[PDB]
């Protein structure tokens, strides 16, 4: 006596279902990456230049200590 009941889609329809490819760009330019790399290299070069010059001075100092102690 009751209404026919069955598994049916809701009145209207269903919400849209996405299927298309979605790969966002999500990246920097090539120039920016290359510039960051070159700047990092230059900073490291300058720091290591100072450090190695100081190390050469220290090495000369201890070599002179040896020279003084040798006789």
């Amino acid at each position: 006596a009751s209404k026919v009941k069955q598994d049916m889609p809701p009145p209207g329809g269903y919400g849209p279902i996405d299927y298309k490819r979605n790969l966002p760009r999500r990246g920097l330019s090539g120039y920016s990456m290359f510039a960051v790399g070159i700047g990092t290299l230059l900073f490291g070069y300058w720091s290591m230049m100072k450090w190695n010059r100081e190390r050469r001075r220290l090495q000369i100092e201890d070599f002179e200590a040896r020279i003084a102690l040798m006789p």
């Binding site: 990092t40 290299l41 490291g44 070069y45 450090w51 190695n52």
Partner: protein, 318 residues
Amino acid sequence: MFMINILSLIIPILLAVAFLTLVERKVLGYMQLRKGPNVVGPYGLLQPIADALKLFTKEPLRPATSSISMFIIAPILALSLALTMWVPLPMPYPLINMNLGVLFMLAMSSLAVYSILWSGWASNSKYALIGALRAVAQTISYEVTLAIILLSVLLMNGSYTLSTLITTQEHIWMIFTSWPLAMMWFISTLAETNRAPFDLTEGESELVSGFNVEYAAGPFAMFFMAEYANIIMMNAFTAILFLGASHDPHTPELYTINFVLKTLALTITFLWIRASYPRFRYDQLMHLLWKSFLPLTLALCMWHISLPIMTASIPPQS
């Protein structure tokens, strides 16, 4: 007292390898939307012990066609060399202080490949032979580029002494001066430890088990321990070479902690890389190393020879 130090080196390395197996399983599980071992002990902390006990209580078998002496010798050589690779590493003091530590590690690494070659040949099986020939190809691919990269990086150090790398990086990491060489060295160490995407010798999808297919039980376990110890050692060496931790002579534990975190991060980076990528073809690996890595390596070797002279920054200690 020196044997005490040898043991205090080797035994914790074996424990670290045992738990690195579990760390790998859990990390690759979580990157794959699962958990990994969490039943055998809390959070799977007892899994490596169960694995070792199962492996060393299982029957080892001699193949009928195998050459017995080389078959037994190869895992012994592998494990002994893996343990030996750790003695010159300064953490911050090395067990063995060498004038030439880097080149010693190079020679021992070159010798380590013969364990794979001899196991594959002495197994007297087709898949093991294919694995051994792939190992020959891999070494031919990576050896020269790796050595020249070491040369170029160490040109700024002034010697081949591993402990000098701490002094060289007192103010800045070496990576900030040689990051292209750092990337190429990282890929070369990935290839050198037979790790994905360069895990050609085992070749599980293609060769079933490759060079170690015949091996079972305890001998198989030693090959596994040797490989994982080599992974940890290579990551520690990379950390020393490119990420210099500040060392206080009156407090070396700070350097030890900093070193351990950096090498753990590099090992986890290997694990991530394995979880992320497919496998190379073993001719493509040689083409990559000989057509892309080798030219840049030669050019950067020239550049790193010229740079200290141009900027008057030659390091001391001839």
